[PDB]
Design a protein around this ligand. Structure first.
Ligand SMILES: *[C@@H]1O[C@H](CO)[C@@H](O[C@@H]2O[C@H](CO)[C@@H](O[C@@H]3O[C@H](CO)[C@@H](O)[C@H](O)[C@@H]3O)[C@H](O)[C@H]2NC(C)=O)[C@H](O)[C@H]1NC(C)=O
Ligand SMILES: [Cl-]
Ligand SMILES: [Zn+2]
Length: 584
């Protein structure tokens, strides 16, 4: 009856803490020390956690969740009824676990080399090339090289991966893996809600796109930019053209109003990766939110190791299910882009700390988008010229020209990301549901790159190419839609918190630093964890239960008016009517 259900939940929680804590550190040691020994221990602990998941997941399935009164106990048991990979027969499970490891390792050790010269890693080398080089062929070298070495090498593993992850999904009651991933949001209208939100950001994105295309035309020449076509994917300062902020020097709306070199400022003033996290820690505590434990500073990998060992460099935050042990793993470079990233990862850590008293099953964000959005919200305030100047990193100010410059800087990071973050799982959901087969992987990737982002490949794609594999989340099997949700909702959070802090006038000038009223709304929402449906947490922060693009539109409203006037006087076509155009 009801007593057996709550007894089971107690027992699940006690044993999960112990086994999840042990899997986490085995996983940590591989991620921070990629060897054969650490690989083998991880694969052994994989079967141990599966053994636990199988045991309690089988017991969970004997209960009737909707025939149980307490909804909190109902919520936990339903979740435990999902075995994930542990639903696969023993042979399939080890094959799947090996495939995952082999995709992750291949991506992380991939290098692009000159014939008789240096071998370059993605971070920081190729990253730096995409950010700083302004030569078409040198950008092309890194862009094509990374796809030849990382993307092409992932292709051999992917079809089998898709089969095994879909098999696990079906055995847990889903139709495919995409269906399983979407279920995390507990929102029947998810796909429609997301498309509506994407459509609302069209006026802003098409105008940014057109403006940037014009500036690329000016710099890279008329023979390489079609003013009515898609932009070549290697020219936006980022390996995946997901954020366009590194090409700010090519697009600055008012060159007469220049801003400080932030990296030069950081490096000169002796900014260390450690200081960047200390400053993020300060922002959280200023809001009355929890500080990171002394253990965090002892066990975290806050920069790339010098011992010449292989690591997973991608930035991640870690919960060890201790209630005491939380870590960040990041190959941090001393610049503004990574300062934003440091806050984002610290946002994860705060979330871990805020819901640490809940049963481990409920230890997750309201939805995965919420988990991503926390650090980004605070970072929106750090990014203001007024806050950056107070860190001695800028000098921008009370001026209309500097104001439009800042909004362009923010838009190249925030608006540009919208179509990309949307695109990734659109391709992926259709791969899981069978709409896209291995014969059309890459072609359907680029149809969507064209359709949503208005980008084209600088070099025509050949057989054997698998460019999705050259993006971290693909071989690592981490979903991507949260980042889309995060970017919409983080402005909703920013708007509400700014109001709660008593700030008036344009939204983009708001800095919530030290606001205890804003901290309170965040804390109460974060404490809920995964115990309640997400619209409850949305309500707690914003005073309303919906996802909405209004906050983002309002934030960038001054920029949209400026972009419309600017694109109008140059006679720009919005979009890419000549959609079949590729470089000669
Ligand atoms: C359904 O079962 C759940 C879980 O057993 C019940 O939720 C629990 O309710 C108690 C209060 O009735 C919560 O305790 C409170 O929180 C802290 C303790 O850490 C304390 O500072 C407060 O003063 C208060 O005692 C407890 O946290 C909460 N547990 C969870 C996991 O949410 C719930 O009451 C049951 N529902 C019904 C309708 O009976
Ligand atoms: Cl690509
Ligand atoms: Zn994140």
């Amino acid at each position: 009856d009801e007593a057996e259900a709550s007894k089971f939940v107690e027992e699940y929680d006690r044993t999960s803490q112990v086994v999840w804590n042990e899997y986490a550190e085995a996983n940590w040691n591989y991620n921070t020390n990629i060897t054969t020994e650490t690989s083998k221990i991880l694969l052994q602990k994989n079967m141990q956690i599966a053994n636990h998941t199988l045991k309690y997941g089988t017991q969970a399935r004997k209960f009737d969740v909707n025939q149980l009164q307490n909804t909190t106990i109902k919520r936990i048991i339903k979740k435990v009824q999902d075995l994930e990979r542990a639903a696969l027969p023993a042979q399939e499970l080890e094959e799947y676990n090996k495939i995952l490891l082999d995709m992750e390792t291949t991506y992380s050790v991939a290098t692009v080399c000159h014939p008789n010269g240096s071998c370059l890693q993605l971070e920081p080398d190729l990253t730096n090339v995409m950010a700083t080089s302004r030569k078409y062929e040198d950008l092309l070298w890194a862009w094509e090289g990374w796809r030849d070495k990382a993307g092409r090498a992932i292709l051999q593993f992917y079809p089998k991966y898709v089969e095994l992850i879909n098999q696990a999904a079906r055995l847990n009651g889903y139709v495919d893996a995409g269906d399983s991933w979407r279920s995390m949001y507990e929102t029947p209208s998810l796909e429609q809600d997301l498309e509506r939100l994407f459509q609302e950001l069209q006026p802003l994105y098409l105008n940014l796109h057109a403006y940037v295309r014009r500036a690329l035309h000016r710099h890279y020449g008329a023979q390489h930019i079609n003013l009515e076509g898609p932009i070549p994917a290697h020219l936006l300062g980022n390996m995946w053209a997901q954020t366009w902020s590194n090409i700010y020097d090519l697009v600055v709306p008012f060159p007469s109003a220049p801003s400080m070199d932030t990296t030069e400022a950081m490096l000169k003033q002796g900014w260390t990766p450690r200081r960047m996290f200390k400053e993020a820690d300060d922002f959280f505590t200023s809001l009355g939110l929890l500080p990171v434990p002394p253990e965090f500073w002892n066990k975290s990998m806050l920069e790339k190791p010098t011992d010449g060992r292989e690591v997973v460099c991608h930035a991640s935050a870690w919960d060890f299910y201790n209630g005491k042990d939380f870590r960040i793993k990041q190959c941090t470079t001393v610049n503004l882009e990574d300062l934003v990233v440091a806050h984002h990862e610290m946002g994860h850590i705060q979330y871990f700390m805020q819901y640490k008293d809940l049963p481990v099953a409920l230890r997750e964000g309201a939805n995965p988008g919420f988990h991503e959005a926390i650090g980004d919200v605070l970072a929106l305030s750090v990014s203001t010229p007024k806050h950056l100047h107070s860190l001695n990193l800028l000098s921008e100010g009370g001026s209309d020209e500097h104001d439009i410059n800042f909004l362009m800087k923010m838009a190249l990071d925030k608006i540009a990301f919208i179509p990309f973050s949307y695109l990734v799982d659109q391709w992926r959901w259709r791969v899981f549901d069978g709409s896209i087969t291995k014969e059309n992987y890459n072609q359907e990737w680029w149809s969507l790159r064209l359709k949503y982002q208005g980008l084209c490949p600088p070099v025509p794609r050949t057989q054997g190419d698998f460019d999705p594999g050259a993006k971290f989340h693909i071989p690592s099997s981490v979903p991507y839609i949260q980042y889309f949700v995060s970017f919409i909702i983080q402005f909703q959070f920013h708007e509400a918190l700014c109001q709660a802090a008593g700030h008036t006038g344009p939204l983009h000038k708001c800095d919530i630093y030290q606001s205890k009223e804003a901290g309170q709304r965040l804390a109460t929402a974060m404490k809920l964890g995964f115990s309640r449906p997400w619209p409850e947490a949305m309500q707690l922060i914003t005073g309303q239960p919906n996802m909405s693009a209004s906050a983002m539109l309002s934030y960038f409203k001054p920029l949209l008016d400026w972009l419309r006037t600017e694109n109008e006087l140059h006679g720009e076509k919005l979009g890419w009517p000549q959609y079949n155009w590729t470089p000669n």
